[model samples]
Target: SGFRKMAFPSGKVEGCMVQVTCGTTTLNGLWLDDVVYCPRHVICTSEDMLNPNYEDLLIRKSNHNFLVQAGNVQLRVIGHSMQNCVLKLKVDTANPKTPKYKFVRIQPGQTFSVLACYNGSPSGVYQCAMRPNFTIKGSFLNGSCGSVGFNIDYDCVSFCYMHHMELPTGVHAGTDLEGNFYGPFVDRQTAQAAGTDTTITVNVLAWLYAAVINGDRWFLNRFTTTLNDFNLVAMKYNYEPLTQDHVDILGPLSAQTGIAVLDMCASLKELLQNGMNGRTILGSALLEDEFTPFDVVRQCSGVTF
Candidate 1:
């Protein structure tokens, strides 16, 4: 999903003056930072990503003892190219501080879903991890397509500059062939993005790049344009028009309400007179909206769209 328009000149070899060859690692005209020679045995793809930390299966309190029907609960694991891999499911409701769960391997091609019911005696968190296997192969050469080099799937000897090889995930953004910053694809332009209720897709370039900053919590400077410096807030808020559709999807009123609550509590010292505990108010308010019909409505909306 990404392309690089980088090239390097060549020099002749000693005996092969005869033509000697050397491989260099570079990004655009700049040198590389880190390079990785991806081997044949390992496949770096969307599948392995499904369970980066391998903790997916989780079901919690309703009652410790009860039959869970698949049709009642759902756990969806996207990507992983696996509807085929070994799906190990684990459940724990034993101790408050203990993680005692057993693995239940489903039938080879059995229907997958958590439909069990549990009493809400010990309210806790339920989590799952999925693991899928995959493979990748690349062919790099020292010369043109007609040149001589190895052709083995797993044993080709070519210059594999990790620093030079690009990643397809995250934001698929880079300078174009003419050296221009390209677009911010929100997700993979295929399957998931084609028709989805979510306004944005994480796999696309935009979502991917934004993930770099949005994914983590880091210190950000407050931009001030009064001192002849650029206004960061203005720059961040400046963008394309927000259509009614965007407003509707992002919650016509809910988004702003969230920011307002966050700001009030965040500026606690200044708004000290407003004294209810911050966490409780914010948490309950957001939680109250959790079961709203938004998701089911969105699902229905996607069908209509």
Candidate 2:
């Protein structure tokens, strides 16, 4: 979980000063960029974002199978708050492209895609016109063209913002009366200067930002500085020292002879490379509420003392 310190000064509204509040990224921040732009978190998350696209319910909608699961989706594209995620379907249902569609009336608590497909057409690129009126949104090359009219699930408001972020303990971060948080470390130098990780109580703060840049895992180490940038990021969100315990659970797991590293982060990236799936290591509950065990031998090695 995380808290934000950014406060916009007061400007009395015409009547009442309204307080307004706000990715698995086909799903990326759109072309335009801003704090409100399509910012995303795709690391050590339950969404498994390991692969490029979100979930591939796609068993592959193939040739001539006009009827497909492709047409059904909770079409998603995370948008800023105050903007409703809207969608319009563009389908090709004929060779020359002329077919009629009857949309279903089932609203299962989610914005369903335009569910319609009439038989017999080549692999057509289906696009969903989304919020702010953009086209050429979604495209899929059917396993084989000329049989299954391609279908797509594109958009419906996924209002998300940067909040509920978590910070680690032992940093000199403070909280306001309303329990709002403010982490003052702007960089590693500031964090190192503010206080040492061992000088205070190990508590969880409001930020745990993670990312993966070009196949490189960018995230905070439980107790190490292996990824200083991740530590920098967590600090920017106002974070502290990550705490840990060394009590052996399973005693030890296999560490390959070819892969020899006494460092925790090194061991982890190597051992965890193909070891666990996303949900098993993490969970679907509050991101902070999830933690599974690994490396029964080097339990405390991952964190810095």
Candidate 3:
């Protein structure tokens, strides 16, 4: 392998550190020829990129809020001595139509996976959805149980190693190559309504039978283990018995959005009660090529954009 190699600036890469286990020591990132992965969050600042020498820039074991990368990536999250810690991950521009955000909970010894995309080669951003800059407050949710100092690990299938990804289907590839298929995006109210039983959420819930139960695994990434159990627990917390911190973690889902976590629980329940694909709750199925809700609506329904 004869090419340029950017040595790790351990001395200058702020907040950069090594994660050592019994037998192995893993660095935060790797930028060989194509992939830029973070087995742990990689750190880099605006000032780092501004340095006259371009050798090192994007990441040097960056933190979640300030995480950035280039080229193909499969993002991951590692857990530590924490319990029911909620994480908000914002995936933005190697540049894209708009930044994507999701909130999920993690506990000690459990590792979670996040978005993995192919486009946006210049520099993709991963951070707190609430702010443009790094914020531990926003990235990790807290109520009464304080979070302890523990490492967050990342790994981009680094091919999401678990998802076993293939390029988008032929139809999607051509369309994807053309760049973002949609020009605009939806807001909270629209998302809330879209999540109703009348909409395609049923289609989504049915298809995810294996994902929830861990029956069939690795459609795109390694399926989360004990997913059903976690869902069960999440459902418990989403109900009458409110932990003090529930407000901090579940408040946004309760009223801030159209598709509340309650709706999600309903979908899960319906799927469990019914047979095959939960009968889509006796609804229709996604067409052969439709990948997401937008695609389902675009191709299956008689709607115009």
Candidate 4:
């Protein structure tokens, strides 16, 4: 009680405006002690991030050109011919000593894909072999979409909130500064537009502001660089900037605190506007401790990060 009566000289210190909400739960305009500190209120949600419709095996055929796309950590085989086909994929990566191989069968207009870890390299050079048992046949083209030799680069990226699944070999997941797993970062405006709960969006905003103020170069630079070409001012929002009434209330709260409050609100405004399209602000990758589309979502809800 005695310490509560003491007043220390106020000087500029980094802070952020933190908020969280779900159902009747809410915490708005709360002051953070420091930018580096992960407050208790910021946590992860158990919302399933998996997409049931996500297909690792992608296939498309147009004008004799067959396009076969694979998931981030997987390989796709497409049968471009009118008859059934049998094919084998050979991948060459960093370790030349041992190359990886995968056999595939595809019906006409069909595709098959699977997680294949060739080596440490993100991009792999591949060649194909046709077997007699593999009867999928069609006209063999030479250039684009042609079979034989091509490079297939892994495309594992971004950890979305709904992506809590177990990742494939050579792939991993990442967490925010709060130790909470990542998904896509959303803002209030986008959440409301999608008719979803705003709890996760608000918390993500708070974490982002904290990262900026704390000088987390990687986190800060990721958004700043990605959104650099984006027209932040042109982005729209449903919320207003901090009103004069709000600033006035900060007067009694100390000069540095007031300034931080203002800065946080301003940053929030900018981010909300930039995030109007609800595009993923942060995502996972394979190189770093990130997640790919193949990862399974963990079954844990109402848990804090």
Best by TM-score: 3
Q: What is the lDDT of residue 196 in candidate 2?
A: 29
TM, every model: 0.16, 0.15, 0.19, 0.17
lDDT of 1 by residue, 105-222 (tens): 2211111111111121111111111101010112222111101111011221221111011123311111211211122211122322111112111011121122122221121112
TM-score quality measure for candidate 1: 0.16
Give per-residue CA lDDT, model 2, range 196-293, as digits (tens): 22211111111111111111223334343344433444444333323333112111321321111113333233323333344322222222211112
lDDT of 2 at 75: 20
Q: Write the per-residue lDDT of candidate 3 for residues 149-186, one digit (tens) a residue.
A: 11122211111111111121210000011111111211
User: What ranking of all candidate models by TM-score puts the best one first?
Assistant: 3, 4, 1, 2
Residue 276 local lDDT, model 3: 42
Each model's lDDT: 0.19, 0.20, 0.23, 0.22
- Of 2 and 3, which scores higher on lDDT? 3
Better of 3 and 4 by TM-score: 3
Against the true structure, candidate 1 has what lDDT? 0.19
The weakest ten consecutive residues by lDDT in model 2 span 12-21
